[PDB]
C-alpha cells in the first residue's frame with residue numbers, strides 16, 4: 001500500500017507527519033525538515049504552519 005503509506009517525497013520512509021493547517025498526511029519527518037523554504041505541503045502546496053506526529057503525542 002505504498003501509495004497510501006509511503007512518504008510522497010522520498011518514497012523510502014512511511015508517512016509520519018500531519019501538516020497544519022491543511023491536514024494532509026503525506027511525509028516522513030526527515031523530508032519535512034529537508035523541504036525548501038518557505039515550507040509547503042507536497043500535496044496541496046499550502047504553507048505548513050506546524051507539524052504534529054501522526055502517532056498521537
Ligand SMILES: [Zn+2]
Nearest residue numbers: 007010028031
Ligand atoms: Zn520522506
Ligand SMILES: [Zn+2]
Nearest residue numbers: 022024041044
Ligand atoms: Zn496539504
